[PDB]
Amino acid sequence: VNSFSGYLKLTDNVYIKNADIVEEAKKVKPTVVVNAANVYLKHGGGVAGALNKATNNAMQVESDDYIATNGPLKVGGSCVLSGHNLAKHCLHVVGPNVNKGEDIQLLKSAYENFNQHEVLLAPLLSAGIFGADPIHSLRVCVDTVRTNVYLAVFDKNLYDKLVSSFL
Numbered sequence: 564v565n566s567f568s569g570y571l572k573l574t575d576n577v578y579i580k581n582a583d584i585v586e587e588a589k590k591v592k593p594t595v596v597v598n599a600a601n602v603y604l605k606h607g608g609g610v611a612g613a614l615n616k617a618t619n620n621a622m623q624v625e626s627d628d629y630i631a632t633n634g635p636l637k638v639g640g641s642c643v644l645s646g647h648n649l650a651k652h653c654l655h656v657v658g659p660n661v662n663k664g665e666d667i668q669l670l671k672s673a674y675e676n677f678n679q680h681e682v683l684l685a686p687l688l689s690a691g692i693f694g695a696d697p698i699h700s701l702r703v704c705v706d707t708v709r710t711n712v713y714l715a716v717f718d719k720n721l722y723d724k725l726v727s728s729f730l
């Protein structure tokens with residue numbers, strides 16, 4: 564049994580809810596929240612900007628030190644950093660950004676990072692300002708992630724479209 568409430572069950576392991584991931588993280592304090600990161604961990608907008616704002620910029624300070632030591636992530640890659648006031652840990656995952664011309668086949672690689680964690684609160688990778696089709700992102704998630712994932716979709720129309728169209 565876990566703390567997650569109000570989710571629709573899509574599969575054995577994937578759950579979905581219309582929710583603000585920031586507000587959901589603050590309520591649940593999950594072991595892992597996933598960030599929709601870029602390779603530079605520059606948390607300017609979208610999910611990343613919202614998560615970072617909720618940490619009062621502490622996520623960005625920590626991220627800048629990580630990049631100064633390790634250099635940029637790979638598209639499709641990830642790193643584990645603090646969850647600050649939102650979660651125990653933040654898994655920063657880089658999905659391909661279609662608005663930069665990145666290979667959408669890298670979306671499966673991105674979701675494979677989730678399999679290193681038994682339970683996660685996450686957004687749909689490469690959705691929103693990353694430019695991918697969220698329907699496609701949900702299909703790759705279901706067909707790639709084997710651990711227990713609680714998805715938060717930001718829009719109410721979008722959520723309803725993802726559920727209605729789910730095979």
Ligand SMILES: O=C(O)C(=O)Nc1ccccc1
Pocket residue numbers: 686687690691692697715716717718721
């Ligand atoms: O990825 C999401 O969770 C999301 O809601 N994307 C979105 C938001 C606003 C307009 C279109 C897509």
